Amino acid sequence: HPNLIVTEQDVANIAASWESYDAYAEQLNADKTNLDAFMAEGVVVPMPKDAGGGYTHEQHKRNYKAIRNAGFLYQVTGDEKYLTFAKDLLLAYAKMYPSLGEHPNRKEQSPGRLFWQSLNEAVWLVYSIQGYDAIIDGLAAEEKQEIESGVFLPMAKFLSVESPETFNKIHNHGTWAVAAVGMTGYVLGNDELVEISLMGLDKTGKAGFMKQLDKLFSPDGYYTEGPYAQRYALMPFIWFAKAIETNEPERKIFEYRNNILLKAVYTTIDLSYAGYFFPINDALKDKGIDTVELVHALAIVYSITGDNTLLDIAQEQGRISLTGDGLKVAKAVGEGLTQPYNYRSILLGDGADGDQGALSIHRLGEGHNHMALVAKNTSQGMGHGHFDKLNWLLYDNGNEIVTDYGAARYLNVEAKYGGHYLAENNTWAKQTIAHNTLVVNEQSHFYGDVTTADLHHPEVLSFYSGEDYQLSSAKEANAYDGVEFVRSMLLVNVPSLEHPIVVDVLNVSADKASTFDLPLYFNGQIIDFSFKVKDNKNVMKMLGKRNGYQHLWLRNTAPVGDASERATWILDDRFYSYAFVTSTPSKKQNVLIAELGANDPNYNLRQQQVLIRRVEKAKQASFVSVLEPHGKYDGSLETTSGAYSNVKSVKHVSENGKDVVVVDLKDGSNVVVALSYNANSEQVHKVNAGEEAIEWKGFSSVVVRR
Amino acid sequence: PNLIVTEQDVANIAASWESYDAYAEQLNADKTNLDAFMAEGVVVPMPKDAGGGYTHEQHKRNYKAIRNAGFLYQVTGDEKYLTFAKDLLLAYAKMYPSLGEHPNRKEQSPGRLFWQSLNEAVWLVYSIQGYDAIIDGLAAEEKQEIESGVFLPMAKFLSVESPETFNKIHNHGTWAVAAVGMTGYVLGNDELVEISLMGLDKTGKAGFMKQLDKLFSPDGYYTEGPYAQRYALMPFIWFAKAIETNEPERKIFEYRNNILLKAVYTTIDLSYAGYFFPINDALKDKGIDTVELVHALAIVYSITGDNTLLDIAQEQGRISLTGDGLKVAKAVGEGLTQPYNYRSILLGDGADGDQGALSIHRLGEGHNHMALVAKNTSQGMGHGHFDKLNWLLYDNGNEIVTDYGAARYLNVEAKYGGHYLAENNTWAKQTIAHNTLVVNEQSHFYGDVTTADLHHPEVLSFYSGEDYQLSSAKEANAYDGVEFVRSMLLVNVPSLEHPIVVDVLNVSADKASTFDLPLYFNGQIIDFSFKVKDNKNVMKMLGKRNGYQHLWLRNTAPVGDASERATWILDDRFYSYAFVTSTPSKKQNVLIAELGANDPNYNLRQQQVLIRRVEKAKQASFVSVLEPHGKYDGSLETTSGAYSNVKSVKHVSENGKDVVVVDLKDGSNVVVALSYNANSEQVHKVNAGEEAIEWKGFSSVVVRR
Ligand SMILES: [Zn+2]
Ligand SMILES: [Zn+2]
């Protein structure tokens, strides 16, 4: 004792050398200052009363932090006042807990006692037990007795044996519950609670931590709900594994399932850009890598691995894990061991077996502010998932360029619907029209039905990442009745251009004449269009009536035809040009510029623009586009350059289900992108375009012609 | 070298430049770039095109290269740099004599190398510094060819051949006399120096000496505003540097009670968190790292030794590549940096500081304090905004209540050639675009510059104490039969987390009127206290003229007797605006509007407004509280104090006096009382909710039980 997240050996190293590292010491001092201010108010442990961001919810949260913090500071400073505060808090908890029935303010959510929902109960336990672990050696037997029989054992019982619908769950709720009961298990030397936590109530292994490790991540370490949920999962996964390693190294917890726990941490990093997680599915955009779960998880992974590329990420976090593992990060950074993070292009297979679609992340360029394309070809992700199959995002120059809205929610802001998911979360954020992907007949994928959406995943047709270019291709055959669409996205290295270009090819076939809309949510200020807007007559009307369209205002229409069109915007010091053609047998084709804010009486939606390509009355359509970063605007030194697009035009020709795209560059050269949709790498292909024939090996080829 | 850099300077730089990392990095970066530009040979094309075209951009690169080559030659000794500078100047000597006015000569006084003579003077101010640095490694016949081919001809053209520009009391005159004046010092030509200091007569009625008396107010304020002030700062401070280096006996940096030092300190005082207050025509991305202020800060540091400027120097993260700049880098390396002292100041406007004023009110530690800007200034001519008594608020490192600046995309060709756009007049200038009063949907002075030029607001009061701060000012000429008066306070309430803004704008008209008072806020709405009427799924254009045709009406809501509230979030902080209008009229509404109407070219940014409207009225008092509060942390997932601490806001008018009561949620209140009488001994009496408030002076603020 302590022998959990921190060992005795760890506290010795901490005590010996913590004052020697500026950042670690600053952060440890901050936590100390703040706890001291909290101690100054005495032992305040009220009766459970409120939910959400209500008083007793928050107080009981402050308390479990103090219990862990005081335990830790007592170990580290040797100072007695920290022991007696943690002790006194725990005793007040011991002499209140056995009297508690279910919380007065429960929901349909599996109730708690201390808290409105048992999730928070389990978090209270995961934190508190660490404080107790740090405090046991300084306690008399009748004190321990009151604590263990009063709070811990009854709480472990409640979250396990009395709550099987939760403790047995193959869900995050389950992970927090087993982590809490299992960690309690270790501190108390209670084999039952460990076995229960590892193998489920019946100890069959049909539930429990091990099954969670098998089921909640894909083999690559991807969590189906997305990064925003993935970083939350990480805390109970990593902390319990730490506990397991600290007490039963012979289980080889960090080796289990080809290092699934290592891969889950790296994957969490690989799902961020410039400090923030890709806001796909239900996600808030300000959640980033300095999040407490990833701070701890990184220290732990560094500690296991000695990977010095993690020191880079740890610096970008600018926040360190106040633990043994964290000290090792602080030490290593001090010694100048930091190597640059290797951002890889990766295919994250979705589902327990990584076969239910995939998320692709394509990376190109040096440092943190490189170019990243995300192709969201994933399964639904259940209730939190968005209706956006084949959606994409693009990041460049430290910014989001082509965007995902995330969730409609303001965390712990009471006046914003108690800080809950807003009505506009279903009404807008989830809807296909809010995403950069195909909308057929103004209806969401799977008609907005989560039950239908749960049944299906996209089909990944190809993934490739070389020095020449990078590709992801996927098919959606189930989003709408008698409709199939295919999207391929490429990042291309064109040596004559300053930055790589995105090439997008989206094919749709319908059985019946339909409207096909393809949005692009861009970030930045419009410079000019190549098309000519129709006068809006000094009014903007709601765009359409259902499935998200009721939140958009129509600002302008503009007619479009055979030749590619262009939009160019600036964002900070760079311009982005979007050049698009749509091959279709139909002759009704428009561009709609729209703006978020319709049916938003509560000002819940933020300001946003979109450019929507519309095709009416079509059975077929190939949406093609190039997105090109270019130029330099320096408002400080008062220079501009490269402000005009270097893409003269874009042409598309299709033959025998094969696609060819020619990007005509202004310097007279051109880029040719060719897609066969055939996986055989040796198969040869031939396409008669307008004027010329093109030929290649494989699913795809990209060549630059002078 | 005896102009901007001296012989001793170059020795200091040569000896030590390598040992100062940031200086070295920037010097190397400068060197790396000039190297790459050299590689492309000596391009000196015939004058052809204008601002943003090829030839215009080429000659700009040249004068910068000439200065930079010259400087690096001196610092490194590498003749490579001398050769390039020599040859560029030699081609200029071979071409300039056989040149009439530029092929794109406008009604705008023309140049020969450039479409206007301004760019010519800038050329010469840069090019003559490079020549000054190259003299050593030159032979008499080259010097003769250089001086006779470009410098002397150019100097004749910019002065004696162009009296209208040269005797102008305007930035155009400052550049021209800086050019010719420094050409005069390098070439040892006494005629050219005197002509630049004292005008073509030598009488003193024009030239640099008048410019120093006329173009700044005694506080060091330039009337067109911070954006124009930063740019003016260059030729003023560079010529003064040349003056000081050659003729220290003129005591140029002492002149007019250190006018030049004051203009540099004032430029810094017109900025927040790195950026200049975007009042009048201004780009919002223009900040303290502009080349003009980097040099001027360095020069002023070398003269003053004020270690306080080293704090600013760090915020600029860009050091002047000169000897003065070297002294800053050394000072910083020694750990001499002191925190800059941000004072609340009254900046009198006009030559004499009497034509209105610009108040800046500051409060808090560090750079990200709270700053209130009250724009009670004169017009500032054609770049001026029709926005008398406008205001701005900055807090927590952000702009909270905002000014649009200009509609313009600098050097972006596909945005009207980088020119001021049609919406600059139609929107950016209009009163409706600003946080101040609009009578009958019409702009101040009916949107007429000539009339606006005739008048300035009257400053009633300025005060700044530990207790509160105030600026109050009267506008009597904005419209026929209308008179208005605004007072802005920052009030320290010890029980509150942050200072508080209190605002009182009285209006008075002959005829029954519409009174609009916009608030352009930055952030996301949390909630309102009032109830919006359903917009029925259309937004229409808000009005037909004077900026109104640019806004969309998103919602109306009705209001009356009681105060209302709008709360919004910006980064980690909440802002609550509580408001009440005392008027005889019973027809008050609040409008939420959005920018973007009549903007087919997408020249305007996305922007929301809260507009307080009062129809059929002859009197109105609009009263506000802007309250910053709380903490939102998305990283740690905690929120605190998201709810306003202001229960309500009540206002009462007596015998042309005003009492404002702000009731706090905790049962306490704050009383603000305004007499409008300057005499500090005069006692005053108002009755509230039949409670009597008595105080002395122009104003009083009490925090009660
Ligand atoms: Zn989404
Ligand atoms: Zn303005």
Curated annotation (Swiss-Prot), chain A:
The active site is at 229 (proton donor), 384 (proton acceptor). It holds the Pfam family Alginate_lyase. The zinc ion seen in the crystal structure is located far away from the active site and likely plays a structural role. However, it seems important for enzyme activity since the mutation of one of its coordination residues causes a high decrease in activity. Could be used as the key enzyme to produce alginate monomers in the process of utilizing alginate for biofuels and chemicals production. It is an enzyme of class 4 (lyase). Changing residue 231 to A: 2000-fold decrease in catalytic efficiency. Its EC number is 4.2.2.26. The record marks 172-173 as: Neutralizes the sugar carboxylate group at subsite +1. Belongs to the polysaccharide lyase 17 family. This is Exo-oligoalginate lyase. It comes from Saccharophagus degradans (strain 2-40 / ATCC 43961 / DSM 17024).
